[PDB]
Structures are given as structure tokens and as C-alpha cells.
């Protein structure tokens, strides 16, 4: 029964705009593509093509400062390092030109911890390391 290793999600290190972010809980990011389904004039099965891409991302975490409210709708980079401690092969991803969809100015319930949620869109990504 040789060793195997999942990647625990607490190994993530998120660098928002070149300064490390400590309080993020979860990060999500995908790279969409318009399918552009094409129904040919003679062939019965549909055909799809790459179309044009579009990045989207989301973040959640605990509020420790007003960094995101200060940031506005500016363009900024996100770098995401997911280390594998059992093999040391960290998978690093860089997102280019991220832009907040909405400033989370206020989001606070009385009896609970003040969490911050962020979502937006990024023009492109660089797979720095894998």
C-alpha cells in the first residue's frame, strides 16, 4: 500500500497584489470559455469551439482591515501557492489583472465574526509552477 497524498486546503498562501494575505478561508478561480456551439449543415452531432475566454474568481475570509475597500475596482494580481508537504511540489498559479466586481464595504451580522467576501474577474493566468 504505497503512500498517497491529498492536498490539504490549509496549505494555501494567497499574495494579493504582492503583499501576503493571511485571513483568507477559501479561494475559487476558473477560466470560462464561450462554447460557440455550431450545428453543421449536414452532420447530426453538434460541434463546439474554444470561443473567447473569461476569468472569474471569488474569495472569503475574516475581515482584518479595509484593504479591499481601499483597493476599489483597480487592477491587481493574485498569486496562489498550494504546497504539498508530503512531496514539496507546490502548485503555484498567478492571476493577471484581477478586478473586483463589487466592493464589500459592509457585511456584518451582530452575533458573529465579520467575514469579507470578494468576487470579480481576471483577464488571464500564468501557471508559474506545478
Amino acid at each position: 500500500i504505497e503512500e498517497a497524498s491529498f492536498l490539504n486546503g490549509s496549505d494555501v498562501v494567497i499574495l494579493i497584489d504582492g503583499v501576503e494575505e493571511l485571513y483568507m478561508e477559501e479561494i475559487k478561480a476558473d477560466f470560462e470559455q464561450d462554447e460557440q456551439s455550431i450545428k453543421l449543415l449536414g452532420c447530426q452531432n453538434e460541434i463546439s469551439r474554444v470561443g473567447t475566454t473569461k476569468g472569474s474568481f471569488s474569495l472569503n475570509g475574516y475581515k482584518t482591515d479595509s484593504k479591499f475597500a481601499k483597493l476599489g475596482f483597480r487592477s491587481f494580481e493574485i498569486i496562489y501557492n498550494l504546497s504539498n508537504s508530503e512531496t514539496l511540489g507546490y502548485e503555484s498559479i498567478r492571476l493577471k489583472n484581477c478586478r473586483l466586481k463589487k466592493l464589500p464595504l459592509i457585511n456584518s451580522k451582530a452575533g458573529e465574526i465579520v467575514k469579507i467576501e470578494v468576487e470579480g474577474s481576471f483577464r488571464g493566468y500564468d501557471l508559474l509552477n506545478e
Binding site: 490549509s10 496549505d11 494555501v12 498562501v13 493571511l22 485571513y23 483568507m24 478561508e25
Partner: protein, 272 residues
């Protein structure tokens, strides 16, 4: 410890003619006299530690039992929760009234009527009153400052001075909520001992109100740390000594203290 109880009973009770060890007195001893029998020492958990049992057997001249009832009330008043200092061993303690012997026995050959009052002593082994639980130290300090009563930290001590409070920790949970952050949750239960039950109610009420209003507690006089309250609950039925009335859940977030090297010097070179 026999000497302390004997000295207290002789000093405070004047109808008493003498207080003796178990099989000391002869048949010409002058009644009423008392006998201090020492019972078991049993382990009763972490909060109480070793609990000792004592009996103060009263003896009387078989005139009537009403005198024995009066003398029993006197003994209970003298010893119940009043701190006693034992000069022989130079250590104090505090007896707790537990009850009374099985029946009121008549002993015809001795021509006497006897009754056995039943006391006990808490935390025989504990002799430090200190804790490495920083949270318990912080909350005991907070309770002492707010309430102006003694506050014992980890477990009962045998010479506790009523009214008093205790702030033991009952349960600890640790979580790594992030790569850099950890969360430490403690369920800390608190006791409030006192002879007057309404004083227990008042002290618990003001302690709860203080904890709720000032929702966090300074962990140290240096500041830099705090203990945010989560939920404070009182179960008034619960035992004063074993369990404790007030239950409070505190949590605290800590950050990993990574102090790795630094990028003091950067250089680069070029080619084509």
C-alpha cells in the same frame, strides 16, 4: 489536623468540657465531651482532589437530647466553612458540613447520649495554588479585581476562604483555521462558594453581567492578547464544589510566528 479542630471546638464552645482522640477518655471524664474521628481520604476528581472525611462525635450526660441538639448546632456553626489554622502542623484548612451520623444513639453502659456530626476537607494534596493555564490565571485575576474575593485557579485548596471563586478549565479545542492562523477554544467552568446562598446568587449575577458587557478579558497586563467570550451560562442547580455553577466558553485566535530569513541583498545578471 486533629489539633486544629480540637482547638477550635474548645475555644469557641464553652459548654464543652474537653475534646479527645478516639479511645482516650475513661469513664470518669466530665461530659459533655467531643471526639474527633478521622475518616477516609478518597480521590474525588481533578477539581476536588483528595477529599478527607471527619466526624466530631458529641457525647452528653443523658439528661435529655435537647442539650445535644443545641451542642450539635454550636459545633456546626463553629466548624462549617470557617477556616481553621492548625498550629501544630502550621497549615490551615476549611471543614465543610456534610451531615450527621445514622441515628442518635444511646449508650447505656457509659450512661450517655451521642451524635456524630460529619464534616469533610477538600484538596488535601494540593499545596500551590498556581496554574500554567494562562487563561485561568487571566480570568481569576479578572474575577478578583471585579469582585474583591479570593479566586483560586486550577483546583480547590484546602484552606479556601469563603466567599471565593474558582476558574478551572474543563475542555480544550484547537483548530488550524488557516495557513497562518490557529484558534484555541476553552470551556472554562466557574464556582462561587459562600456560606450565604443569596451571596452566591449575587456574585454569579454580577460576574455574568461583567463578562457579557466587557465581552473580552485581557489575557495579560502587557495587553497584546485578549479572550473573546462566546457564551456564558449558569446552572444554579449544579453542585457548588464538584461541578460549579457558571459555564463560560472563550476562544482566542493566534497567528503563527514565522520569523524566517530576509531578502536583504538582491542581485541579477544578464545575457542574450
Amino acid at each position: 489536623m486533629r489539633a486544629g479542630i480540637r482547638k477550635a471546638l474548645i475555644d469557641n464552645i464553652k459548654e464543652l468540657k474537653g475534646c479527645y482522640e478516639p479511645n482516650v477518655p475513661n469513664k470518669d471524664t466530665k461530659k459533655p465531651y467531643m471526639v474527633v474521628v478521622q475518616g477516609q481520604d478518597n480521590d474525588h476528581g481533578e477539581t476536588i482532589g483528595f477529599e478527607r472525611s471527619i466526624e466530631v462525635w458529641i457525647y452528653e450526660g443523658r439528661t435529655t437530647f435537647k442539650k445535644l441538639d443545641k451542642l450539635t448546632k454550636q459545633v456546626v456553626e463553629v466548624l462549617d466553612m470557617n477556616t481553621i489554622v492548625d498550629e501544630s502542623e502550621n497549615e490551615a484548612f476549611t471543614c465543610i458540613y456534610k451531615g450527621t451520623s445514622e441515628n442518635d444513639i444511646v449508650v447505656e453502659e457509659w450512661d450517655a447520649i451521642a451524635r456524630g456530626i460529619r464534616f469533610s476537607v477538600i484538596a488535601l494534596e494540593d499545596k500551590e495554588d498556581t496554574t500554567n493555564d494562562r487563561w485561568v490565571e487571566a480570568l481569576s485575576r479578572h474575577t478578583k479585581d471585579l469582585l474583591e474575593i479570593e479566586s483560586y485557579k486550577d483546583n480547590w485548596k484546602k484552606n479556601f476562604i469563603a466567599p471565593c471563586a474558582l476558574w478551572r478549565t474543563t475542555h480544550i479545542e484547537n483548530k488550524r483555521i488557516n495557513y497562518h492562523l490557529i484558534e484555541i477554544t476553552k470551556t472554562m467552568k466557574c464556582h462561587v462558594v459562600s456560606k450565604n446562598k443569596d451571596e452566591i446568587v449575587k456574585l454569579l449575577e454580577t460576574l455574568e453581567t461583567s463578562l457579557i458587557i466587557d465581552k473580552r478579558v485581557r489575557l495579560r497586563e502587557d495587553k497584546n492578547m485578549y479572550l473573546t467570550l462566546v457564551s456564558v451560562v449558569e446552572d444554579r442547580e449544579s453542585d457548588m464544589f464538584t461541578t460549579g455553577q457558571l459555564t463560560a466558553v472563550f476562544k482566542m485566535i493566534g497567528k503563527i510566528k514565522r520569523e524566517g530569513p530576509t531578502m536583504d541583498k538582491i542581485y541579477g545578471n544578464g545575457n542574450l
